[PDB]
Amino acid sequence: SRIEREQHHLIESIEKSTQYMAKRRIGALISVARDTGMDDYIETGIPLNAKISSQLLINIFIPNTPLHDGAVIIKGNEIASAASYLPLSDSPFLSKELGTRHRAALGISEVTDSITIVVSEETGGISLTKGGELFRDVSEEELHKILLKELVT
Ligand code: NA
């Protein structure tokens, strides 16, 4: 039950935090590492190695705070780092309305098998990137279905 409880708790933490930040137009960028190691990007951020919670994710992305300027990276059972760097995609197909967070989430999805969640600070929509593809402005049910299928083993 250990592995499943942690993965479900991760999904619930992402859902609750993203809902909180989308309601307040708080920009967020959360990348969940999988098979492809993301240690190179983890080292670019502030190390946390913290237990996963929605409360911590919310506190990290509060605007104009030391931990918010960058991406959160989740590795296994922990929030590995915050304010981490993610590479900007070169793709000209990404819409110009989308900001730097979507391009960074797209960029990391092109070079890793990670699942990255984006909360737009301009629109409040939640977006997903995976394998160089973008799911823009997903609903609560769509986000729940995608996270369950991808993050639960
Ligand atoms: Na486009």
Swiss-Prot record:
<dbReference type="GO" id="GO:0005524">
    <property type="term" value="F:ATP binding"/>
</dbReference>
<keyword id="KW-0547">Nucleotide-binding</keyword>
<feature type="binding site">
    <location>
        <position position="69"/>
    </location>
    <ligand>
        <name>ATP</name>
    </ligand>
</feature>
<comment type="subunit">
    <text>Homodimer, required for active site formation.</text>
</comment>
<keyword id="KW-0808">Transferase</keyword>
<protein>
    <recommendedName>
        <fullName>Diadenylate cyclase</fullName>
        <ecNumber>2.7.7.85</ecNumber>
    </recommendedName>
</protein>
<dbReference type="GO" id="GO:0006171">
    <property type="term" value="P:cAMP biosynthetic process"/>
</dbReference>
<feature type="binding site">
    <location>
        <begin position="99"/>
        <end position="102"/>
    </location>
    <ligand>
        <name>ATP</name>
    </ligand>
</feature>
<feature type="domain" description="DAC">
    <location>
        <begin position="1"/>
        <end position="140"/>
    </location>
</feature>
<comment type="function">
    <text>Catalyzes the condensation of 2 ATP molecules into cyclic di-AMP (c-di-AMP). c-di-AMP is a signaling compound secreted into the host's cytosol where it triggers the cytosolic surveillance pathway (CSP), a host pathway of innate immunity characterized by expression of beta interferon (IFN-beta) and coregulated genes. Expression of truncated proteins (missing first 80 or 100 residues) in E.coli leads to c-di-AMP synthesis.</text>
</comment>
<keyword id="KW-1133">Transmembrane helix</keyword>
<feature type="binding site">
    <location>
        <position position="86"/>
    </location>
    <ligand>
        <name>ATP</name>
    </ligand>
</feature>
<dbReference type="GO" id="GO:0005886">
    <property type="term" value="C:plasma membrane"/>
</dbReference>
<feature type="binding site">
    <location>
        <begin position="120"/>
        <end position="122"/>
    </location>
    <ligand>
        <name>ATP</name>
    </ligand>
</feature>
<dbReference type="GO" id="GO:0004016">
    <property type="term" value="F:adenylate cyclase activity"/>
</dbReference>
<comment type="similarity">
    <text>Belongs to the adenylate cyclase family. DacA/CdaA subfamily.</text>
</comment>
<keyword id="KW-0067">ATP-binding</keyword>
<keyword id="KW-0812">Transmembrane</keyword>
<keyword id="KW-1003">Cell membrane</keyword>
<keyword id="KW-0548">Nucleotidyltransferase</keyword>
<dbReference type="GO" id="GO:0106408">
    <property type="term" value="F:diadenylate cyclase activity"/>
</dbReference>
<keyword id="KW-0472">Membrane</keyword>
